Design an enzyme around this catalytic site. Structure first.
Site, PDB file in Angstrom:
ATOM      1  CE1 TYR A  17      62.693  40.104 -27.412  1.00 18.33           C
ATOM      2  CE2 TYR A  17      59.790  38.689 -26.888  1.00 18.33           C
ATOM      3  CZ  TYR A  17      61.585  39.949 -26.531  1.00 18.33           C
ATOM      4  OH  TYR A  17      60.592  41.181 -25.683  1.00 18.33           O
ATOM      5  N   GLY A  73      54.869  38.530 -35.571  1.00 19.69           N
ATOM      6  CA  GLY A  73      53.359  38.188 -34.894  1.00 19.69           C
ATOM      7  C   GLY A  73      54.137  36.645 -34.154  1.00 19.69           C
ATOM      8  CE1 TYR A 104      59.711  35.035 -41.943  1.00 23.07           C
ATOM      9  CE2 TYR A 104      60.172  33.486 -40.113  1.00 23.07           C
ATOM     10  CZ  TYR A 104      60.478  32.965 -41.515  1.00 23.07           C
ATOM     11  OH  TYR A 104      61.371  31.841 -42.253  1.00 23.07           O
ATOM     12  CE1 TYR A 107      62.768  44.722 -22.208  1.00 24.36           C
ATOM     13  CE2 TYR A 107      63.225  46.677 -21.745  1.00 24.36           C
ATOM     14  CZ  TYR A 107      63.012  45.564 -22.243  1.00 24.36           C
ATOM     15  OH  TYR A 107      62.038  45.638 -23.190  1.00 24.36           O
ATOM     16  CG  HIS A 162      62.402  40.876 -32.031  1.00 19.40           C
ATOM     17  ND1 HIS A 162      60.678  40.631 -30.962  1.00 19.40           N
ATOM     18  CD2 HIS A 162      62.326  41.983 -30.272  1.00 19.40           C
ATOM     19  CE1 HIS A 162      60.636  40.307 -30.009  1.00 19.40           C
ATOM     20  NE2 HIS A 162      61.597  41.519 -29.479  1.00 19.40           N
ATOM     21  CG  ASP A 163      60.602  35.506 -34.202  1.00 19.67           C
ATOM     22  OD1 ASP A 163      60.134  34.526 -33.338  1.00 19.67           O
ATOM     23  OD2 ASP A 163      60.829  34.276 -35.318  1.00 19.67           O
ATOM     24  CG  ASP A 183      62.144  43.974 -26.015  1.00 23.55           C
ATOM     25  OD1 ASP A 183      61.763  42.649 -27.023  1.00 23.55           O
ATOM     26  OD2 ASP A 183      61.647  43.579 -25.165  1.00 23.55           O
ATOM     27  N   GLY A 189      55.932  33.012 -34.763  1.00 25.94           N
ATOM     28  CA  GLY A 189      55.741  31.695 -35.382  1.00 25.94           C
ATOM     29  C   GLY A 189      56.104  33.088 -36.623  1.00 25.94           C
TER      30      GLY A 189
END
Ligand SMILES: [Cl-]
Ligand SMILES: [Cl-]
Ligand SMILES: [Cl-]
Length: 118
Positions: free
Chosen positions: A50, A28, A26, A66, A46-47, A92, A30
């Protein structure tokens, strides 16, 4: 914004953002299958974070600037009123900390095309 995420990573950890480009299923661009380890879980969350940020008006994960501060190794998200920024700094910050506390299994770099990300 992606440059702010890059900086958070080296704020909260020893490893820089480039360590993670090629990690597991996961980390990087995709992802498929089961996250192989704790670190791969970090990227999986995190993926999705986003992806959930697109559901906020005027919110793009890559370009949204931000407010945060780095008191190495400490990250602080400053935004309260700006919900997109608040949410995104959080995606993040969560990951930068998740990356720093998680073991790095060198055995799990370069596996995306193997039977484990299936
Ligand atoms: Cl994607
Ligand atoms: Cl929704
Ligand atoms: Cl929009």
């Amino acid at each position: 914004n992606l440059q702010q995420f890059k900086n958070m990573i080296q704020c909260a950890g020893t490893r820089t953002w480039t360590a993670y480009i090629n990690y597991g299923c996961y980390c990087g661009k995709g992802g498929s299958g089961t996250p192989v380890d704790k670190l791969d879980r970090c990227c999986y969350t995190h993926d999705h974070c986003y992806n959930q940020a697109d559901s906020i008006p005027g919110c793009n994960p890559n370009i949204k600037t931000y407010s945060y501060t780095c008191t190495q190794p400490n990250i602080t998200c400053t935004r309260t009123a700006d919900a997109c920024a608040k949410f995104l700094c959080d995606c993040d910050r969560t990951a930068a900390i998740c990356f720093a506390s998680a073991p790095y299994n060198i055995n799990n770099i370069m596996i995306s095309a193997s039977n484990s990300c299936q």
